[PDB]
Each structure stands twice: as structure tokens, then as C-alpha cells.
């Protein structure tokens, strides 16, 4: 249903739906299980507590 998504004055981080299928934070290399933020615009599926630390602007 959610077709519009959070863009804001940077990464857009589109929440990876984990109802069945893993996430890996590209950022580090490990696995995520909260709902990775995968900012397609320009970055990657991320953990979430580790999107605090990504102060990056969309590339
Ligand atoms: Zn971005
Ligand atoms: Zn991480």
C-alpha cells in the first residue's frame, strides 16, 4: 500500500520489509534484523542503529 516514502533533505532509506526475507548491512557486513534502511538513492541497506551514524547527503 505505502508507495510514497519519507524522501526528506537526503537519503530517502527505503525500510526492507524482514517478514521472511534477511538483511545484510552493507555498510559493515554483517546481518541486520530490525527493518534495515536501504537508501537506493544512493547508498544501501543499512542496520538501523546504524543510520545515526551514516551523516552522509544523498549522493
Ligand atoms: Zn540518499
Ligand atoms: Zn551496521
Do not use: Y
Amino acid at each position: 500500500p505505502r508507495v510514497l516514502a519519507e524522501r526528506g533533505e537526503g537519503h530517502r532509506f527505503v525500510e526492507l520489509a524482514l517478514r521472511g526475507g534477511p538483511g545484510w548491512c552493507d555498510l559493515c557486513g554483517r546481518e541486520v534484523l530490525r527493518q534495515a534502511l536501504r537508501c537506493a538513492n544512493c547508498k544501501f541497506t543499512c542496520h538501523s542503529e546504524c543510520r545515526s551514524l551514516i551523516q552522509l547527503d544523498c549522493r
